[PDB]
Each structure stands twice: as structure tokens, then as C-alpha cells.
Amino acid sequence: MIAQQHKDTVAACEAAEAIAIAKDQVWDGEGYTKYTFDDNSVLIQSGTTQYAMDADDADSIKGYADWLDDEARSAEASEIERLLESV
Amino acid sequence: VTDPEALLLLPRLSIQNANAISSPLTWGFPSPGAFTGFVHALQRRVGISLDIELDGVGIVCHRFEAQISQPAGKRTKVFNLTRNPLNRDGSTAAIVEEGRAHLEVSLLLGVHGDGLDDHPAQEIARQVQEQAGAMRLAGGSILPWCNERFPAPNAELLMLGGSDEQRRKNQRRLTRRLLPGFALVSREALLQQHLETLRTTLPEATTLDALLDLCRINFEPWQVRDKPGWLVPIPAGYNALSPLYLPGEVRNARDRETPLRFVENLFGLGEWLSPHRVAALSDLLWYHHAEPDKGLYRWSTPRFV
Amino acid sequence: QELRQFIESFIQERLQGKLDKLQPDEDDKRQTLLATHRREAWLADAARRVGQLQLVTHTLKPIHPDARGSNLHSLPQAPGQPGLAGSHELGDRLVSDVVGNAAALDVFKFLSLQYQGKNLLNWLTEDSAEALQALSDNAEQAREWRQAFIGITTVKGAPASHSLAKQLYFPLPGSGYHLLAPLFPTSLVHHVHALLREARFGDAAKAAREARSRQESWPHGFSEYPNLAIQKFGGTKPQNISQLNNERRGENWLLPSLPPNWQRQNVNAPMRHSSVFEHDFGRTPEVSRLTRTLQRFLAKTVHNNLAIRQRRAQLVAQICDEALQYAARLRELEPGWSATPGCQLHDAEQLWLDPLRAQTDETFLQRRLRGDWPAEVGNRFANWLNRAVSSDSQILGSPEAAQWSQELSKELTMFKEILEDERD
Amino acid sequence: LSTASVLAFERKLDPSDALMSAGAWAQRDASQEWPAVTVREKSVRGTISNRLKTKDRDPAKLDASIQSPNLQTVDVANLPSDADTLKVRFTLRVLGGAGTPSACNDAAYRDKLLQTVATYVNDQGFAELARRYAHNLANARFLWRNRVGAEAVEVRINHIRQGEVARAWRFDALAIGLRDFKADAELDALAELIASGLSGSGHVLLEVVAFARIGDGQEVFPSQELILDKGDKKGQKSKTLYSVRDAAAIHSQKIGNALRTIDTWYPDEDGLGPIAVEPYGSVTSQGKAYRQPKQKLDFYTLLDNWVLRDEAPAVEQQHYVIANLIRGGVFGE
Amino acid sequence: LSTASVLAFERKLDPSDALMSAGAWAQRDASQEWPAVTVREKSVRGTISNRLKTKDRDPAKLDASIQSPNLQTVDVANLPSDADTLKVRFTLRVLGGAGTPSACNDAAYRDKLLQTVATYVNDQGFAELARRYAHNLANARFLWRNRVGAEAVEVRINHIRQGEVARAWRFDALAIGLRDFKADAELDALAELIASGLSGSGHVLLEVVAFARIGDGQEVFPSQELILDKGDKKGQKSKTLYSVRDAAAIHSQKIGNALRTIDTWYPDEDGLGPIAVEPYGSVTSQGKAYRQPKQKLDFYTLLDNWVLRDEAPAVEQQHYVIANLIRGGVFGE
């Protein structure tokens, strides 16, 4: 949760992700990355908006799925049901 | 592109797990650039201690087998892979894919050097195959003895020797050692010929050979086309996409003494031919010719047709 | 302030996209921070994170997934010789796929509207009036924004390859070496995936395929692609490798380039009845292809003497070439070519086939096949070549049948001159 | 001095695929025209026997899931029903020149590396590594599951110069154990042949033949293809087996994995067996990586501290690092 | 301590495909040259005899369906017209080392599992399990439908040390019941041999031959293959039988299913006879799973309680768990 403060600075985001596991990316009509953290947190950045999310949290992953749009329902559905499964 | 004074038949070579990818747009037999680099490697490591000059290479490809599979309802094919060792934490490895194949090729090596008169032919042939039995040919191991490696002796033959009857007789006696073979040549002029034929709509050369390894079903007023030969797409060299750099400029090069440029490979066309249909054998050999100021690095069979 | 109407519309769409369903406080702050740029500094909010992508024309991540090199994205090359396909043949309408951190796709979307009705973003290599047509800010910020917008199809910082990036040595004519690092043509393979989906799928080619199945199809031409291979990139995560879209989920389609004998047949060469009804002919899939080509070449005429006159040299030479290749491919697996019960074409084909001068095939076999030559195998083969196609008033009542008879005599003389050096 | 950013070693001890062919024991002296072992297909109607995820554990779902069973097509290789011996034959070649990298940036690093390797070779030969390689050829590691529960295994090795057999060996792969590298006179002779080959001193071409008496019609285990994309679960084949031409065979990379099993120096226990020589030396069957970089026994650590910084390791870790240089590898930053 | 995420056991009691051959009883002793049973074909037309879904139960639609052709081709295997005895011959290896896994992540888990299995093998033999396995070889469970209605079955088991017979048994598969694990002398000798195989104390290979006297020209039952369905007019093949080089045959796993039908300890009954050893032991013909996980006699529940938490279950359920380890399987999550 230090990363959601320092939002647009991808130097600190890449440091706080380089201590952690690697980087996921989404290609559709819009554009998303994912910064999945060590303690089961993620961080999608998108230009100058974001949405932090820590898993093992059902409301956070549902509003996380609500935060994404409808052409991200074409992809990403087999993963937003995967950590829905993982509980 | 010198004319050969001799020919050397590395007679029968099983290749273990070669590279069946060849380009970003092909998957079959490996690129002939691998064969040109192999004969140049033999020119380096023994071709100067015998005072000779090995340039041409004649690909034969008796028996072929690739490690592929078609996945059960799908019409296309996929490749059989290998397990790599585990990760640093022992989790799993990221899978890149490599096609692997088994070749049984025979190599015809053109010789140009002045040492053809200083050495007996059997000593030249024995040392060449005894060196080549410890090398690799498309990223694939060159296999030793098997159940039927009875034609183990290499043979050397000077094409200039004798009368015209003698030359053509000894040629057709060589062709009895290429018995199920199929030689691979370059047919660039036929690509330009069919492009000049069907260049009404689009004269892009990618569309041309992308509509040649095919069956072309024309309809009623079905008359599918007739195949002139076994035309297959090949990679045919490299074309540059960067200005050339000094030997110290490019980070992470293979050395620091040679200039490096980032290139793109350059697709072509050629077709497999029986060793009876060719006129002589000196017209069959592959050569590397590069124009280094431009970015045109390529290989072909010059003086075939 | 000349023709920035599309820029104002994009700023309004960016303010109404995030601000379509926003909160009061965080939504109001984000809408204000978006709109205050969206007047003029939206180029500034783009050019802050303008270096998270790259208009790659030849990427290097497809070679090894864990290589960190240079994604050089220049135009393909000069043509040079005649027959060389590549990135040079595309020219206009190529897919310069963007590669990088895929969270700043809005910056590439904003920079990707200057060609759809403009001459400042798709044509931003010139037209300084087209560059200043919507900026209206200071000259320093305008110059920095123009530099950030030009730095989206440029280098990554230094010319850098990797140890997992497929470098090679090419030999020069008489001299040393150039080192060659080939890259993956992402643009060319996206073009060829579009062409293969046009040729294999869609609606028109499928209408032609089911009209083929209707048995009385309309005039059209459709494709069929056997022996394609599939090469996947990225493994299970093919979107870290960039713009692998919904036609390429890591889905390279590789054309066949296999050898002529890339499907082997275990040649059980017996002297039995199956080697008796096909012992003098050698029936096979290649033999059936040659017979079908001869039956199609039976209804030919003599008014195309430069093409059909050239077709018979390959269709007639290919028969003798395939017969000699079949004799070679059969003449190694069997150790001793013994006389087989049912060798009707193996009466003289007991030496026309694989003659083994072993202890079994002794000097009496080495003298029967030594002095006796395979002319009867050659004469029987010439009779089989004459009887492959039929015999009518076209083989004797024209010069095209005269051309066929001269070609049959020439092919028989060539096969006999080959077979004379076989036992001799 | 920094490391070379490009390091690449070509492999020595390059084996082929091992074809499998079957016949009767006590006729194995003339086992030259034995028929091969063919891969066939058969059907499998299975059942549900997995661990369930404690939410799908109701009796109705179990009953309704074994209503519709699991139907598969697998590949099987078997002996013929009148032959009890498995002949597995391949050729190993020992190249030599094992300290020279195949791609190196820094010419100073390559000079220091070759000084280090020749200092190793003069201070102690390739005798230890070649006797461990001679063991893993003399027993039958390359018969992976084909070795388990066989009653008589015989290994025949032939050194080959030209079209003639230079020297013959006949080992016994069950007397020669799987764990304790005991010395022998024939193992020392074959090990001296391998160590002559590895030092670039001769042409060494072996021919490794192993016979395993298992029983009439029993199942043999060729290696298995790695296929990722299959069909739509109806017509798919869940198990493909490797075959070079009409003959069930074993891959060359796992015979080379069998030869590489030397490493009795990883810091857990030599009581848990030798493992295969790898960097970060890791076992895929165990799923766990011994010899971590958080310890100091990793190949990168030992090579960098013994080439750059002249912190020469223990003699056993020198054997490990030269075993990696014999293995091959594409190293670097 | 928790379970390993990967466990894998290799099967012991590893049989071969049984091959079928036919001849005359009391030539039964010279059944070495008996010709095979060839899978053949015949044509079949059937009528409408399945249930109707009440919307095809109109009379005119039914009569139109009956006037339709309903042909298809099937495979059959029969005895010849002058042969009334079916011979079924397979082989079997008993390996032993029946608690050691072949792929185990967690090294502490496999240590405590080997302690538990070694405790079992210490205080009890493999005596009850080999007694039950030698029953299912002593009768003719591996003749599945071929035993049903036969008037005389007998079994001949030869233990094989080299190309030579050590000991021969000859049983009477109809006197040895299909239910009662009774007591016998020669059967106890076979149980001692199989228990020495399972314990690791010898080489066990069996030649199991069984003769079923059926009748002239009657039908025998190889195991049936798996074909995919298409809409071919006038009859695609609707039934494929399994065979080897032109000889009808039973799959090896079907014989192996017959041999591990030793489980009389399931909570439902034991007057219903033994069922086969499966995790949550299920019968596919009866469509239900005996030994549900919620009534805690499942293999996974017993193994988790007995390895992770030292709760030794009842003695018979310990026989069940060790029978699952002799079975093999893909364990872990």
C-alpha cells in the first residue's frame, strides 16, 4: 500500500514489483497492466487512474471486476473466476 | 562463386534433433544457410590445414522425419517439446518452442584449393569425414554408426578429370550414391516470373509465394491448378534493418571484434529435384554471397539455370 | 489553434470516460486533474508516460521470452534482387504493433488518431503548422510534447542485444565477418495472418467451400492449407508479448517446406502376387499421381506447343525419374532380391529389381545379370509407358501424338542409357 | 574483471536416441536382427479417483460423475508375447575440449577461464568424472523404469575406431550398484577411455547396448512426448510415446540426464542419492532445487569465485563445476 | 506437516495383455500350438427397442421408424466350430517396495509415509493381501464374461526364474468360489510367493494360463475398444474389439482390475462380495461409489488421518490403504 500512494512513479512501482512476482498486462480496446504484490495484493495502473486490490477479499475482487469494463469481460473472465475460486 | 575443381560426397549422415523451424514463416527442412555455415566451419577448422578451399554444398535429404503431431480434430499441426530443468526455486520453466527433426542428408562439397595435387584423395576424404563426425549441422548432432552404416567411406572426385564421356560417366556413377535423394536448389527467377504473370492486382512478392505452395481450386463456368514442381517456400538470406555498428558499440554481442547489424530475414523460393533431372553436379551447389555496404546478405545456387 | 477539433473531442472523451461514473471527492479530483490537462496539457499527461510503449516493426521478445534487447522498428529494406519477400514489400497499410507496458494504451490511442483525418500525428514527421494546429501552449512545453510524441517509434536508449537473441556470423567474400542479429517480423507475420484468415475463414471463402459442397458452385477461387504448423509464444501468458490479438493468441502459422519424401513408406518389396500385379508397373501414390496427370494430359491439344509441349518433358521425365527413385528405394531394404513366386514382372525384374551379388546371388546370378542386361525391363517399362495412357486416333493422327511418340522414344533411350551403366 | 555477458558451453558426451527391440535371452549374443518394439494404441475407460476440493464432495456429484466415466486413448509399448528380453541400443560419443566456451564476450575472461581449466586438468585429471560416467554407463541408469524389477540386466559396450570393434566390455548392471561408486578394473579401463576422450586426446566413440530380462509380453516404457495442444477431449490421445522409425525409443536428452547423475556433493545428503549435474542443481521428480544460490555451492557462484576472484573451492566443487562445463549451458548475466 | 502437493506411486502387480486361443479340452495339456481367436466381422440390423421420450411415442412415427433401415457392423470373436475350450494366457510381475513413491515434493511427508508403511510391513506381512490376490488368480476373475456359464474352468500358474519353470500350480476356478476367501495348501504356497514378491524378498514372475470350457463355436469376449460416432449411411462400425497381431485380446488393466478385487471391508456389505480397490471405492457397472468420503472410510481420509495425525485406523482399513498403495495412482492435490 506504499505503491498506491506513489501512483504514476513507475520507478517506485517497478521497485515494489521487482521485489515481488512479475508483471501482467491486458490488451483490449482499453489498456491495463497488473502489479501483483508479494502479500496477495495487485495494482492495475491505467494512465492516470488505478485501482489497488488485495486478494483473499471477496468484495474487493467483485468491485475489482466491476472496475473493469465490458471488453475486459471477453478476456479476464477465466481469471476473475480463478481467484473467485481461490478462497 | 568460383567454379569447383572437385566434389566431395559426405555419403550418408544421420542428423539427431536438427532445427525444423528455419524462419518465422516456414517449418519444414532446415534453412540452407545452416548448410553454408557448416561448410564454412569445416573450411575453418580443417580446410586450411589441407591447403584447400571448400565452398559449395549440395543438399540431398534421403530420409526425413519431424517430431510433430496433429491435435485430434484440428487440421494444422503442433510440435513435440522437451522438459527443460526447473527454475531457481524449482517451480517450472517458461516454455519457448523449438521444432526438432531427424535428417538423413548427403553433402556434396566443392573444392577449389591448390592442395588437391599434394594429397591423396582418400586422405582428404577420410580427414574431412573424421572431422565432420564431431560437428553439428543444423543445431543437430551428426550421428555415428547405426544398424546399416555400410557406405562409411567418403569419396572425392575431380570434375575436370578426363574426357567429356569420362566426366559425364563418372557423374552418373556418382548419382548411384544419391539413390532416394532429392536435391534442393534455388528458383528465384521463377518467383519473379510468376509475379510478372499475376502482377495485375498486387505485385507484392509475399502474396506470390504465399499462393504457390498450394492447391488453387478454380470453379465451374473444378479446375484446380497443376503443380510445375515441388515448389516450397525457403528463407533466402538476410536484409538489414539498422545502420551497421562498430565492434564495441552493440551491447551483448557474440564478440567484440566483429561488426553487428540487426537484420530481418528474406524469404524466397526453391524446389526439390531428383539427382537425375540435374544436368551436371557443379550447378547444384549452394554458395553464400553478401553485399556488405548495403544490407543484402544471402545464399543461393548460382549458375543453376 | 487551427485544426485541433479531434484533439478537443479526444480530451472531452477522456474527461467523460473516467468521469462517466465517478465519485464526489475522488471522482471530482480525478475529473479535474483529467480535464485541466484535457484543455491543453493532455499531451503533457501523455508525454509523462510516453515512454511506456514503442511502435515496434520487428520485435525481439518472440525469439526468447526472457530476452531484454532492442525492439528496432524501422522500415524493412531496399529490395535488391528480384525474388526476396520481406518487410520491404508492405509499404503502406502495415501493422506497426505497439510494445511495452500495456497500461498506457490511451497515449498510443491519442497518437493513433493523427492519421484518421489529420496531418500532424500520422504525418508528424513534417508539417510544423500541423504540429502547432492544436497546441496553443508555450514553445518549450510544445517542443517537449513534440519530442515525447516523436519518441514512440524510436530506440529504447542504446543499441543492445542479448545473450538469448540469436546472433550469427556471416562470411564475407574473401574477408572477415559481419555479425547478424535477426529479429522477428511482427508486422509481416500479422499481415500474413490477416491474409490466411481471409483465405481460410470469413464468409466468402466459406461460401465457396460450402458451394463446393453444393456440387455446383459459382465462379470463385478458394484456398486450402494442408501441413500448417502452429508455434505458440508466451506459453500461458501470450499478452505480455505485445499485441498478440484475437487472431494470434500466440498463434504463428508456419508454411510447409518439407522435403519431397517427408512421409516415408516401408517398402515391402516382395515377389508375391501384390508384387506381381504391380511388379512391372510399381503402383503407388506417386504412380497414381503420374497416371492421373497422364489421363489429364490425354485430353490435351497441339495448339499450345510452348506450354503443353513443355509439360510433357516434365510429365515424361518425371515418370522415369520416379521409377529410378522407386528402384533405388526398393534396392536397399531387401538383402537378397530372390526370385519370388508370382514375379511376373520379376522374370527379368529379378535383375531389373535389386540385384544382390552376395553369396546367395552367386556368380551364376552375377553372370546371368552380368551378361544379360535389363533391356527387357527397359522394353517392358517402355511398353508400360505406352500403355499408361490409352491408344487412339490422337496418338497417331497428329504431331502432338508424334511429339508423344518422340518423347517416349527419348525417355526409353534415356532410361536404357541409365540402365546400361547400372550392371555395367 | 567482470564476467562475460555471453557465456555458452557446447555439450560433451553427446548421446543419440536409444531404439528398443525385443527377443529371447541367451540368444542376445546374436541380437542383431531382433524385431523392434512398436508403439500401439489402446482404449482406457477410467474412473474418478482424484482428491476433491471439499466443496464438491457430495454423494450425488460423485455418483453423477462416475455415471459418465473418463474415456481415453493411450499409447503402449509391450514386448511380444514370446520374447522376454529388452535390447536398448544407442551410441555415445565423447568429444573433448571441455574448457573452451562456444560464445564469450571478454577475451580476458576466456584466457582466465582456460588457465583455470588447464590448472584443474593438470592438478587432477578427468579420472573422477570419467569413472562416475563409466558407472552410469556400467549400470543401467538410461533404462529408467525398464530397470525396475528386472531380474537380469547385462550391459555391453563397444569402443569403435573405424568399421571394427576396438574393445568390448560386458558389465552386469545389478551387481554394479545404483548408489555406491565402487571401483573395478574394467570400470577403470573404460573410465580411462572416457577420460582420454574428454581431454581431447583421442577419438572415443562408444556403442552402449543393454539387455533386460523382464518377462514375456510385459510392458516397456519408451519416453513420452510433451504435447500441449490436443483435441476437444473426445478424440484426443492423452499419452503419446516417442518413436524413431517404427520403433519405440527413448529421447537423447534423458539418456544424457542418466549419464549426468554424478552430483553427490549437494549440501543436503549423499544418502539421498546422486542427482543430475545442473546449475542450481534441481530435480524435476522431487520438484525441488537443491544447491541454492542463497548458499554458496551454486555453479555461478563457484565459477565466478574460482575464475575471477581466485577463491578456489574444495576439490569436490571443482569436480562439480567441470561436470557443468562438460554438461554445457547458456549462461550469462 | 502437510501432504505433498505431488505424490505418485507406480503400480505393482503389473500384468500383460491376455491373449486368447482356442482348442479341445483334454488336449488342454498340449495347449502350446493352439491357434488364436481371430476378431472377425458380421453385419447386424436391429429394431427399435430403446425407451421412447413420449414425443416419439405416436404410432405412425414409431412405424416409420421401424420401416427404416438400422444396420451397422460389429466385431465378434467366437471359438471355432470344432473347439470348445478358450485358453487365456497372460503374465504378471510382483515388484515390491510398495510404499515408496516415485514423485514426492515434501521430503518430511515421504519420510513419515515410509515410517508408517514400514510399521505396517513390520507388524503384519503382505500375507492377507497376497492371500486375497492369489485367490483372485486362483479363481478366474480375469475371465470376465468368459467365466459366466462355463462348465469347467481351471487355472495353471507357473513361477518363472529363467527360461524355465520353478514351480507349477493347477487350480479349479469353479471350486474356488467367487466370494469366500477360503483356506487351501497350494493357494497358501502361492500366497507366500506373492507376499515375498511384494515385500522385496525375491523375483516373482507368473505364467497365468486359464482354460474355460464353453462350447463349440460359442462367443468369447475380448475387451472392447473405443470408436467415435459419425452419421454414416447404412452402417458405420458400432463395435471394435481389442486385438494384437491378429489375435483377440483382453486389456492389461482389465485383468489388473480383476486381480485387485479384494476389498470386502467397505461399509455397505461383505455378503455382496469384494469390490475393486479404488479411492472412494466405486463400481462402474453399479454406477455408485461405495465408501463415500462423507462416511469417513475414503482412501484420502484414512491416509490423511494415518500419516499426518498418527490416527491408525482399523486393521482392515489399513489393508485397504496398503492395497491402494500397491495399486498405484496419482495422489496429491
Curated annotation (Swiss-Prot), chain A:
Keyword annotations: CRISPR-cas system evasion by virus, Host-virus interaction, Inhibition of host adaptive immune response by virus, Viral immunoevasion
Function: Allows the phage to evade the CRISPR/Cas system type I-F.
GO biological process: symbiont-mediated suppression of host adaptive immune response; symbiont-mediated suppression of host CRISPR-cas system
Organism: Pseudomonas phage D3112 (Bacteriophage D3112)
Keyword Endoplasmic reticulum: no
The organism's taxonomic lineage, starting at the top: Viruses, Duplodnaviria, Heunggongvirae, Uroviricota, Caudoviricetes
Protein name as annotated: Anti-CRISPR protein 30
Keyword Lyase in record: no
UniProtKB/Swiss-Prot annotation, chain B:
Miscellaneous comment text of the record: In this bacteria, Y.pestis-subtype CRISPRs do not confer resistance to phage DMS3 or MP22, but instead are required for DMS3 infection-dependent inhibition of biofilm formation and possibly motility.
Observed phenotype of the null mutant: Mutants lose phage DMS3 infection-dependent inhibition of biofilm formation while there is normal biofilm formation in the absence of phage infection. Loss of production of crRNA in the presence or absence of phage. Disruption of the entire Y.pestis-subtype CRISPR region disrupts crRNA production but does not alter phage resistance (possibly OLNs PA14_33350 to PA14_33310, and the flanking CRISPR loci), indicating this CRISPR is not involved in phage resistance.
Disulfide bond annotation, renumbered to this chain: none
Oligomer status and interactors: Interacts directly with Csy1; part of the Csy ribonucleoprotein complex with a probable stoichiometry of Csy1(1),Csy2(1),Csy3(6),Cas6/Csy4(1)-crRNA(1). A Csy3(6),Cas6/Csy4(1)-crRNA(1) subcomplex is also formed.
Family: Belongs to the CRISPR-associated Csy2 family.
Pfam families the UniProt entry points to: Cas_Csy2 (PF09614)
InterPro entries noted in UniProt: CRISPR-assoc_prot_Csy2
Gene: csy2
GO biological process, one term: defense response to virus
UniProt entry tagged with the keyword Methyltransferase: no
Organism, as annotated: Pseudomonas aeruginosa (strain UCBPP-PA14)
Keyword field: Antiviral defense
NCBIfam families: cas_Csy2
CDD domains per UniProt: Csy2_I-F
Record-given protein name: CRISPR-associated protein Csy2
From Swiss-Prot, chain C:
Task performed by this protein: CRISPR (clustered regularly interspaced short palindromic repeat) is an adaptive immune system that provides protection against mobile genetic elements (viruses, transposable elements and conjugative plasmids). CRISPR clusters contain sequences complementary to antecedent mobile elements and target invading nucleic acids. CRISPR clusters are transcribed and processed into CRISPR RNA (crRNA). Cas3 and Cascade participate in CRISPR interference, the third stage of CRISPR immunity (Potential). Involved in crRNA production or stability.
NCBIfam families reported for this sequence: cas_Csy1
InterPro entries the UniProt entry points to: CRISPR-assoc_prot_Csy1
UniProt GO BP: defense response to virus
Consequence of gene disruption: Mutants lose phage DMS3 infection-dependent inhibition of biofilm formation while there is normal biofilm formation in the absence of phage infection. Decreased production of crRNA in the presence or absence of phage. Disruption of the entire Y.pestis-subtype CRISPR region disrupts crRNA production but does not alter phage resistance (possibly OLNs PA14_33350 to PA14_33310, and the flanking CRISPR loci), indicating this CRISPR is not involved in phage resistance.
Name under which the protein is recorded: CRISPR-associated protein Csy1
Ranges for region Disordered: 66-87
Family membership: Belongs to the CRISPR-associated Csy1 family.
The organism's place on the tree of life at top rank: Bacteria
Keyword Chloroplast set for record: no
From Swiss-Prot, chains D, E:
Alphabetical keyword list: Antiviral defense
Superkingdom of source: Bacteria
Pfam families according to UniProt: Cas_Csy3
Gene null: resulting phenotype: Mutants lose phage DMS3 infection-dependent inhibition of biofilm formation while there is normal biofilm formation in the absence of phage infection. Decreased production of crRNA in the presence or absence of phage. Disruption of the entire Y.pestis-subtype CRISPR region disrupts crRNA production but does not alter phage resistance (possibly OLNs PA14_33350 to PA14_33310, and the flanking CRISPR loci), indicating this CRISPR is not involved in phage resistance.
NCBIfam families in the record: cas_Csy3 (TIGR02566)
Miscellaneous comment as given in the Swiss-Prot or TrEMBL entry: In this bacteria, Y.pestis-subtype CRISPRs do not confer resistance to phage DMS3 or MP22, but instead are required for DMS3 infection-dependent inhibition of biofilm formation and possibly motility.
Quaternary structure and interacting proteins, as annotated: Part of the Csy ribonucleoprotein complex with a probable stoichiometry of Csy1(1),Csy2(1),Csy3(6),Cas6/Csy4(1)-crRNA(1). A Csy3(6),Cas6/Csy4(1)-crRNA(1) subcomplex is also formed.
Protein name stated in the entry: CRISPR-associated protein Csy3
